[PDB]
Structure 1
C-alpha cells in the first residue's frame, strides 16, 4: 500500500550525564513529562545517578523507556522501579532475559525484595503465576503464541540485554516477542552502549503507536585503564589511560619488543601488588583448565578462607549422592578452589560451576580462569581481567578479538565500590598495526542490527493464529523498519540527478564521449591481455628471482618491484614474493599499502598472488640475498631506477604470443581489437586538443555520477524475505502441514508444539511410525541427535538397536532436503543429515538403563557439561513430544516419551 513509518524523535534537554530523546508518532505533539505524582514506587539505599532518575520518571509517566549504559552503571535500578509500580498498582509484570543463568540468580535477587515472583524457564516452573514472572524470551514467545492468559494483566515487559537481539540465531525470538506483545504493554529495555539506540525507539513507536524514550550515558562508575603485554617482556605497557587517551608511543614500544610461565608471572604479579581478584579469560577449555594447574604451585587463600571454601563446597555438594560426590571432577575441583584458583567452563558439572560462582562473589576465589561465555553471565565483576590470547578462532579461520568482545570482557573489571580503579591486560602474540589496536581497545560498540531468520515454527504458529499472517511479522520486523533509509535513497537520486544536469551544460558534445568509449574499451581490452599473462602456466616459469614485475591490487598500484621467489601455498592459488615499494607504515603491519606520493617510501617483501601482477618485464636485475637490512632493500630501488632512466618508454615487457610462452589460446583476438581501437583513437578528432586533460576529466564525472544515480535506483524497488516465506510455505504444503489455502492441518499443529528442535522431521518421523515399536530407551537416544550440535568427537560404535533407528532418521532427513531443494530452498543434504549428531546416542541409552554418570562420562570424550546440556534439552524435547502426541492421540507414544523423561531425570543431572 506504500504506507511507510512516520515517527519523529524530539530532543529532551538533559542535565549533564545523559542524552534523552523521545521517539513520537509524527501526528502526536510533544508534551513535557509529568513529575512524581506518586512519592516513590521503590526507594534505593544508593544515591541515584542522573540517568537513573530520568529513566525512572519515564516509568512513572507510563511511557516506555530504552536505557543504554555501561555494564557497571545502575541500569537495573530502572527494572526494579518498574517491577515496584507494577506490583504496587497490581498490574502484573514480566522480566525477560537472554540466558537462563541470568534468570536463575535474578529470580532470587528479585524474590528476596519482592517475594511475589515466579520463574518460567524450560527447566523449571516455580510460582507459575505471580505478579512478576521471570520468563526467558523463548518461553514468552511460546506463551504469546499459545494464547496463554499470563499476558492478560501484564503492562510492563522488561527486556534485559536487548543487545542480544543482534545474534542471528536468537534475534528472531526477541523481535518476534516484541511484535506479538500487545500495543497496550509499555516496555523497559536495558542495553549496553549501542550506536543505533534511537532507531529502536522509532520501531517501538511505529510498531506499538506509543513513545519509546531513549536514555544514553557513557558513565562508567570505576575508571578502567587498559594495558598490553608484549611477548618475552619484563613488563606491562600502558596502551590506554583512565582518561581513555590512546598512548601510541607506549603501544608501538610494547610492539617494538614483540619483534624480538608467562601467564604465571602476570598472575603472580597481580596478586603481590593487590590487583586481585583476576578473571583470566582464556578462549579454550583446554587452555583455561591447564593454566590453572600452573598456579596450583602457589597458595592464594588464608587458612580461615580454606575452611570457608570447605564449608561451602560440602554444603553445596551434600545434595549429590554418595557415589556421585566422588566423580572425577568433584574431587579434583575442591583442591584447586582451596588455593583460590577456579575454572569457569562449559565442560563443568553444573553444581560445581555454581559453587565456583558463589565463592567468587564471596571472595574465596582470587584468580578465576574463565571461557568467554562467563562474560555473558550475570555480575561476578573483578579488579583485573587478563586475556590469555588476543586471537579467537572463528572455525573458518583464526581472527583477532572484535572491538565488541573486548568491551564486554573488559567490563568485568572495575567493581564499583571495592575498587577505586580497574585494570585490563591483553597479551599479544602476533604483530599488530596501531590501526588494529586503536579499534580493539577504543572500539565503538557494535550497532544493534536485526537477524530475522524465518523458522517453520514462526510460519506455522502464525497460520494457526487467525488474526495474524506470517507476512505480518516480515513488515513489522526490524529488518523492514530500515525503511527509514529508502527516503534517504530517494534524496540522493533526485539531488545527484540535478547535479548531473549542472555538469551537463559544462560537458562538451558527444564527440569527446566517442573517444571516451574507445579510450575506455582499450583499457578494458588491456585488462584481458593481463588475464592471460597472470595464468600460472605462462607466468610462473617466468616469475624467476630478480625479475622486474609490476603488482596492482584493486584500486592500489604498487608499481615496479623485483621478484624474490616463486611458490605454491594456501584450483591452487600461487603466491610470489615480490619486493615492492610500500609505505614506511606498512613495515608495522601484521594489508601492505602502496607508497604515497609524498614519501619515497621503503621497499619491502609483500607476498603477492600471481593473479595481481599487471605486467611481467623482460629485465631481470640482481637481488642481494639477506634482504633484511634497510640498506639492501633500498639498494634495489636504485637498480629499478636505472632501468627506468636508461629506457624512456619504460622497462621492456615480454610479448605473450612470442617471448612469454605459447599463446595457443586466441589472445590474438583481444590483441587484434586492441590495435584498431588505438587506430580509432588519435584518428578521433578530439585527440591531444589544448586543455584536453581537463576537457576529458569532466566526461568521466558524468559517467560515474550516472553510475551512482543508476545504481541507487536499482536499490529502490521491499518484500525482502518473501521469497523465503514463499518457498517455506510450499515445503509445508507438500509435506502435509498446511492446506493450499494456507490453513494449518493436524500434521502442522503437532509441529507447533516441538519448538525446541526440528519440527518438520520429528512430526514426519512421528507419522512414519519411527518412534512406534522402539523401546523408550531407544527413543530417548534418537531425540538426542536433534539436540547435540558439537564437534571433535568420534561416533561410539552403534549396535542395531541404536544404529537402525539412526539409519531411519536419515531417510526422513534426506527426503526433507529433497522436498526443500525442489522448493528452491538452500539446504545442502549433507549438512542437514549431519546437523543431528549421533555422538552422544550411546551415552543416553546407558543413562536410561540406570548406569551412573561416571559410566556414561567414560563412554564418550565429550566434556561432562556437553552431556548435561544435551540431557535437560532432551528432557524438554521429550516434554514437547509427549504433548504433541496428545494431538494425534497416540496413547503409547505419550506414555513412552513420558516414561523416557522419568528414566533420564535422575541423580547428578537435573540436580
Structure 2
C-alpha cells in the first residue's frame, strides 16, 4: 500500500481566566476572552493505483446529517471521508466531539436504506448509546447478551463480542451493512478485550466501511495502513490535540502552602513557576486542598488514588468538613434510597450502606472496585448531579463512565505495581486529568498535582506535556478461537496471524532494524586492530576468566554459604543487577523473601533472600523515601551518584544477586534503625572504613574462611589458575599498547555480538506461528484430529470463549463426576479440610507436561498452581449457603463478589450450544441454584 494526501491545519478558539494564581494566565484579548489554538493532522493510506481525490478538494453535495453549530476541521474532514465512502479513523480527546462524526455516518447509512453497526466494548455503554441514538434516529437496536431489542433495525448497537460471534456465525445482518463504527478503539491494546477488537475487524468484509473512534494516540497511521492492507481500501486518519475547555496544571508541593501553575493553556511550560515550585520541597495536605477548593469554589472534585485502601482513609477525613450541602441532603437521601429497598432485604443490611450515607450526606463518597454496581452508579448519578462534592475515587472507572469536573487532583506522581513505585506516564496523566473540565459549565478545568519529590524538568515535561500510549497489538492465539478458526470455512489460523495487527507492527519494524544493522555493519567493519589474531586469543582468554569467576561469585553469594556470615555490620560490595555499583556498604539485616502479591510465586535461590545494606554512594536526589521494605525493586530515579555528583546515606533492599563481594569485616550497626542520624553516623563509619582501604576491603576467602570445599568448586578455581597462566604467558607482556589494542578490539567484539542480536531480531508472522504450531500439536493430542479438523472434544470448547482454561475444564468433565458440596472447586480456576483438589492437580501437570511436551511454556507448579487454592474453601462454604458470614471468612471486597459470582457462575452456566454425563447437568443446576438465590435477582439497568 501507499501513503499520500498529508497535511496539517491550524485552528484557534476563544474563551479569560486567572484561575488559581494571582495573575491572569494568558495575555488578554479586548473582549475579556482568550485566543487559543490547536492543530489537527490528517493523512490517508491508499491501495496501489487507487484513483484518489485530495480530501481537501472535496465538496459534499448532500449533507446527510446537518448540524446547528460550526463544525471543526477535525470533524469536518472525517465527515467528508464518510461522504466519500472512505473508511476514517478519528482520535481526539473524549470531548465525545467524535460523536458528530458518527452521527453523520449513521444518518448517511439510513439515508441510503442501508444498515450500520455501532459497537462499544461494554453492555452498559451499549444501553447508554442506545438510548442516545434512539432518541435521535428512531430505528435503532440493541444487542447485548443482557438486552436484545428490535433487531430488525437499520442502526444496530451491539457489544464488540456480539459482533465477533456474528462474523464467526452467520454473517447475517452484515449483508445489508454499510458502515461499522467502533467506539473506544484505543481499547484494542488491552491485554484482554484487545484481541476481540482485532479479531472482529480482521473478520469483517473488505466491502464494509469503517469509522474508528479513539482517544488521542501517538501512531495511529500504523493502524490505517493495516486496514488499508487487510480490507484493501482507503483509510483516513484524523487527529487533534484539541481540548474541550482548556486545562491548567498546578504542582502542589508537600510542605504545602503555595501552589504553582506549571503548564499553561498552550501548552506553554511555565518553567520559572516550576523551578520556584521544586524549590519549596502527608495526610493533611489533602484536607487543606480539599477545603480550599470548596471555598475557592471549583466545586466538584475527583481525588485520584491508585489503591482502594487510600480512597477510603482520605474520603472520611474530609467527611468532617462538607457535612453541609445539607439543605441539598434535604433532597439527596431520596434518590439514594430509590435503591436500598430495591434490594433483597438481608443483602440490604450489613456495613454496606452503613457509613457511606453520612459521606453521601456530607456530599462525599469513595469509588469501589469493592462496592456494588448500583452503590457506584447511584454515586455516579450523585456525581452527575454533583450531590457528592469530593469522591475519593480510584485510577480505574467502569470503562468508562461520564464524570463531573472543574477539579482533578492527583494525590501523587507515582504508581505502584508490586512494587516499582514508578512515575505516572504521559499516557496515564492524559486520561486521569482528562476528566477535569466541563463543556460550557467550566471556563477551565483544573489539574492539581501533589508532588513531594525533587523532580527534573525533563521528567515532568514528559509527564505533564507527554503523549498517550501507543496503540500496540494485543493479539495472541487462544484455543477456543483456533478451533473456531478451524471449523468455519475460508478462514485459516495462518490467515488470522498473517492478518493480525500484531504481525503487521512486526512487519514494519524489520526495515527499521535493517537500517541500523546495516549501520552497525559499517562500524564493526570499520574498526581494524593490530595482530587481531594475537589480541583475540588474548581477549577471549580474559573473558573465559571473566566468566569463571562469575561462577565463583555465584557460589559465594549463594544462601547456603553467604547467609551464615552477613551479620549486622558485615561489609558487602554492592553492584545491583550488575549495572549499579554502590560500592561497599554494610549489612543492616536480611530476611526470607515473602512474595505477598503472588502466593504461588517461585524465586531463584539468590532472589529468594532480601538484604538491607547501608550504602553512602547514593545519588542525592534519589527519592529514597519511596523504597519499601525488603523489596529490591528500586524505583526509577534511585541511582548511584557518578563522578562529580552529591551522595547520601541510604538503606536499600537487595537480592544476593546484587552482591559483588563479602568483606572480612564488621562495623557497628545501631539496632536503633535509621533513627535521627543513626544511619548518618554509620555513614561516617563507612567513610572511615572506605578511607582506611582506598584499594579495597579484604574479602573473605571461600576456602580459608567459609569452609567451602566442594569438589566442583575447586576444579573451577583450578581452571582459573590455568587461564591466568596462559594469559600471563601471552606476549602482551605490557605491550605498551595493550590498553589501546584491547580497547580497539573490545569495541569490535561488542559491536559483533550486537550485530548478532540485531541479525536475529531481523528476518524472523513467522514469530506468531510457533504458538500456533505448538497449540495444534497440543490440540491434536486431544480434541482436534491430526489433520487439524475439529473432533468431538473440540466441541467441548470451541463454542465457549468465557473459558476458565477451556482444556483443563473439558478434561475434568470426561473424568470426574463429583458430589454437590465439593465441586465448588471451580473457585480454584475462576478466582484469580476435605479436598478433591488433587484431581485437578494430577490432571493439570499431565496437561502441563503436554504444554511442556509440545514445547510451549511451563508445567512445574506454576501451571499446577495456576488454578488457585487460596480462596477455594471460601467459595466452597458459600455453596452451603450468610452473605455477611462468608465476608467474615477471608479478606476480599464485596465487589469481588458480583464479578466472581457472575464469573464462577458464568463459567458453570453457558452449557446454550446444542445436550449430554447426566449426573453433571442436574447436580449442577443445583450447583447454580445454591449460589444465585443467595444474592438473587442480580438485576442492574439504567
- State the TM-score bracket (shorter-chain normalisation): 0.7 to 0.9
Q: How many positions carry a matched residue from both structures?
A: 874
- Seen in structure 2, the aligned counterparts of structure 1 residues 533 and 344 have a Cα distance that, compared at 3 Å, is closer
Matches within 5 A, 1:388-537: 388=411, 394=417, 401-427=424-450, 439-481=462-504, 482-504=506-528, 508-525=531-548, 527-528=550-551, 530-531=553-554, 534=557
Tell me the residue number matched to 1:218.
Answer: 241
- Seen in structure 2, the aligned counterparts of structure 1 residues 380 and 707 have a Cα distance that, compared at 3 Å, is same
User: d(CA) in 2 for partners of 1:255 and 1:201?
Assistant: 46
User: d(CA) in 1 for partners of 2:888 and 2:609?
Assistant: 44
- Seen in structure 2, the aligned counterparts of structure 1 residues 48 and 613 have a Cα distance that, compared at 3 Å, is same
Deviation at 1:14, TM superposition (A): 3.4
Matches within 5 A, 1:439-838: 439-481=462-504, 482-504=506-528, 508-525=531-548, 527-528=550-551, 530-531=553-554, 534=557, 551-553=574-576, 556=579, 558=581, 561=584, 563=586, 565=588, 567-568=590-591, 570=593, 571=605, 572-573=608-609, 575=611, 577-586=613-622, 590=626, 592-597=638-643, 599=644, 601-602=646-647, 604-605=649-650, 607=652, 611-614=657-660, 633=683, 640-641=690-691, 643-644=693-694, 650-651=695-696, 653-654=698-699, 656=701, 660-665=705-710, 669-670=715-716, 672-674=718-720, 677=723, 680-681=726-727, 684-689=730-735, 692-715=738-761, 716-735=763-782, 737-758=783-804, 759-760=806-807, 763=810, 770=817, 785=827, 788-789=830-831, 823-825=854-856, 826=858, 828-832=863-867, 834=869
Checking the alignment, whether the CA contact within 8 Å between 1:97 and 1:136 is kept in structure 2 is yes
1:665-692: CA deviation from partner (whole Å, max 9, x where unpaired): 4666555555565554565445444555
Q: Is residue 910 from structure 1 mapped to residue 939 from structure 2 by the alignment? A: yes
Matches within 5 A, 1:32-431: 32-33=54-55, 35-72=58-95, 74-229=97-252, 233-234=256-257, 236=259, 238=261, 240-242=263-265, 243=267, 245=269, 257=281, 263-285=286-308, 287-289=310-312, 291-299=314-322, 302=325, 305-310=328-333, 312-313=335-336, 329=352, 336-374=359-397, 376-388=399-411, 394=417, 401-427=424-450
Which shows bigger deviation, 302-311 or 899-908?
899-908
- Seen in structure 2, the aligned counterparts of structure 1 residues 309 and 491 have a Cα distance that, compared at 3 Å, is same
- Seen in structure 2, the aligned counterparts of structure 1 residues 602 and 842 have a Cα distance that, compared at 3 Å, is closer
1:592-630: CA deviation from partner (whole Å, max 9, x where unpaired): 544433x26435346465654545667989999986798
User: d(CA) in 1 for partners of 2:572 and 2:77?
Assistant: 65
User: d(CA) in 1 for partners of 2:353 and 2:10?
Assistant: 53
Checking the alignment, whether the CA contact within 8 Å between 1:788 and 1:840 is kept in structure 2 is no
Tell me the residue number matched to 1:3.
Answer: none
Which shows bigger deviation, 38-47 or 584-593?
584-593
Checking the alignment, whether the CA contact within 8 Å between 1:432 and 1:589 is kept in structure 2 is no
Q: Which secondary structure does the structure 1 equivalent of 2:90 belong to?
A: strand
Q: Which secondary structure does the structure 1 equivalent of 2:192 belong to?
A: helix
User: d(CA) in 2 for partners of 1:536 and 1:812?
Assistant: 34
User: d(CA) in 2 for partners of 1:528 and 1:276?
Assistant: 64
Deviation at 1:75, TM superposition (A): 2.4
Q: Which secondary structure does the structure 2 equivalent of 1:372 belong to?
A: coil
Which shows bigger deviation, 318-327 or 219-228?
318-327
Checking the alignment, whether the CA contact within 8 Å between 1:603 and 1:637 is kept in structure 2 is no
Tell me the residue number matched to 1:794.
Answer: none
Note the aligned Cα RMSD (angstroms).
Answer: 4.6
Deviation at 1:173, TM superposition (A): 0.9
Deviation at 1:144, TM superposition (A): 1.2
- Seen in structure 2, the aligned counterparts of structure 1 residues 238 and 610 have a Cα distance that, compared at 3 Å, is farther
User: d(CA) in 1 for partners of 2:931 and 2:824?
Assistant: 15
Q: Which secondary structure does the structure 2 equivalent of 1:18 belong to?
A: strand
Tell me the residue number matched to 1:647.
Answer: none
1:363-392: CA deviation from partner (whole Å, max 9, x where unpaired): 333222333332632321311123456565
Tell me the residue number matched to 2:32.
Answer: none
1:187-241: CA deviation from partner (whole Å, max 9, x where unpaired): 2222223223121122112111112222222222233333455556445555555
Q: Which secondary structure does the structure 2 equivalent of 1:14 belong to?
A: strand
User: d(CA) in 1 for partners of 2:366 and 2:651?
Assistant: 43
Q: Is residue 11 from structure 1 mapped to residue 6 from structure 2 by the alignment? A: yes
Checking the alignment, whether the CA contact within 8 Å between 2:202 and 2:496 is kept in structure 1 is yes
Deviation at 1:635, TM superposition (A): 8.8
| Equivalent of 2:910 in 864, 880, 893 | 880
Which shows bigger deviation, 321-330 or 754-763?
321-330
User: d(CA) in 1 for partners of 2:924 and 2:680?
Assistant: 77
More helix by share: 1
Where structure 2 has 5 or more consecutive residues not aligned to the other structure, the ranges are 12-38, 594-604, 627-633
- Seen in structure 2, the aligned counterparts of structure 1 residues 677 and 209 have a Cα distance that, compared at 3 Å, is same
Which shows bigger deviation, 373-382 or 89-98?
373-382
Checking the alignment, whether the CA contact within 8 Å between 2:663 and 2:700 is kept in structure 1 is no
Q: Which secondary structure does the structure 2 equivalent of 1:459 belong to?
A: helix
TM-score normalised by structure 1 residue count: 0.82
User: d(CA) in 1 for partners of 2:592 and 2:849?
Assistant: 37
Which shows bigger deviation, 713-722 or 567-576?
567-576
Where structure 1 has 5 or more consecutive residues not aligned to the other structure, the ranges are 1-5, 645-649, 791-796
TM-score normalised by structure 2 residue count: 0.79
User: d(CA) in 1 for partners of 2:886 and 2:569?
Assistant: 63
Which shows bigger deviation, 359-368 or 327-336?
327-336
Deviation at 1:314, TM superposition (A): 5.5
User: d(CA) in 1 for partners of 2:687 and 2:920?
Assistant: 84
Checking the alignment, whether the CA contact within 8 Å between 1:540 and 1:566 is kept in structure 2 is no
- Seen in structure 2, the aligned counterparts of structure 1 residues 579 and 870 have a Cα distance that, compared at 3 Å, is closer
Q: Which secondary structure does the structure 2 equivalent of 1:748 belong to?
A: coil
Tell me the residue number matched to 2:16.
Answer: none
